[PDB]
Design a protein around this ligand. Structure first.
Ligand SMILES: O[C@@H]1[C@H](O)[C@H](O)CO[C@H]1O
Length: 283
């Protein structure tokens, strides 16, 4: 099976586009696509596991040559993956994994390591036994179970947890969640958000309650998050590479149809971004 990279039809299923991170992914994907002459159709799922399933079959009937999927639920996507497996359409996973199904390659970070660096930053900045919140994400996404595991590794010891509720990777839900979390625990010192949308939402809740020394740590490295660090609204973020993610996914589809072997796993590098680092690792 060797098709031409020129005029290659690819489907791209992104969970939601309300998130700047997954917008940066789309934009970097289309830039790579047009640079190597790949025809591409992106389909937003709006954090729906069923709209994604229908978005997969629409690509399947579009007769695309590969489907770049960013799952919303890592368990529910498996059924649709076997559907593309039967149609002999290679599946490439991005940012989040899946619990089963035949996948050509997976491009994503070490989300366990991402949780690692956030607790390490808190313990290194605010000492040990410091009172902290966690803002978890979509419970069915592999990125939130891994970020929570890697965080609590260095958080069972060295840190005191007041709460751990989820805001589903959403600014607004995190704003409300944080505000209520503060009401109970006025003595909070650190807030860990598994994504920058929640970090930015916690920052508004912290400053609306008049708290002045609550260190905030996020994950993604989004342009606005660099700006909050300079403005002092948050303290650090764990940078990801959303564009470089979807661009080594596209090249994997090209390399597959080129008769070249592609790695089953590709770990995207992550980086800490503090007030001294704000100029680096930007998307
Ligand atoms: O890695 C991505 C980003 O952190 C985004 O903010 C939410 O979904 C995660 O999987």
């Amino acid at each position: 099976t060797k098709k031409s990279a020129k005029d290659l039809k690819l489907g791209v299923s992104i969970s939601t586009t309300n998130n700047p991170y997954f917008v940066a992914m789309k934009d970097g994907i289309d830039k790579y696509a047009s640079n190597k002459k790949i025809s591409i159709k992106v389909a937003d799922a709006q954090d729906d596991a069923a709209r994604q399933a229908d978005d997969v079959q629409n690509f399947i009937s579009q007769n695309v040559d590969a489907i770049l999927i960013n799952p919303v639920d890592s368990k529910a996507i498996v059924t649709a993956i076997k559907s593309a497996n039967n149609a002999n359409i290679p599946v490439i996973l991005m940012d989040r994994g899946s619990e089963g199904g035949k996948v050509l390659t997976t491009v994503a970070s070490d989300n366990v390591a991402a949780g690692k660096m956030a607790a390490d930053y808190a313990v290194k900045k605010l000492g040990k036994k410091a009172k902290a919140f966690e803002l978890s994400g979509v419970p069915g996404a592999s990125a939130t179970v891994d970020r929570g595991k890697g965080f609590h590794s260095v958080a069972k010891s060295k840190l005191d947890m007041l709460s751990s509720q989820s805001a589903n990777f959403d600014r607004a839900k995190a704003l409300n969640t944080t505000q209520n979390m503060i009401q109970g625990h006025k003595d909070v010192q650190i807030i860990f958000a598994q994504n920058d949308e929640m970090a930015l939402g916690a920052a508004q809740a912290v400053k609306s309650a008049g708290l002045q020394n609550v260190l905030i740590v996020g994950i993604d490295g989004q342009p606005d998050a660099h700006d909050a660090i300079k403005k002092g609204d948050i303290s650090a973020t764990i940078a990801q590479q959303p564009a470089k993610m979807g661009e080594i996914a596209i090249q994997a589809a090209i390399d597959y149809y080129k008769g070249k072997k592609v790695e089953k796993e590709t770990i995207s590098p992550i980086y800490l971004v503090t007030k001294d680092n704000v100029e680096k690792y930007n998307w």
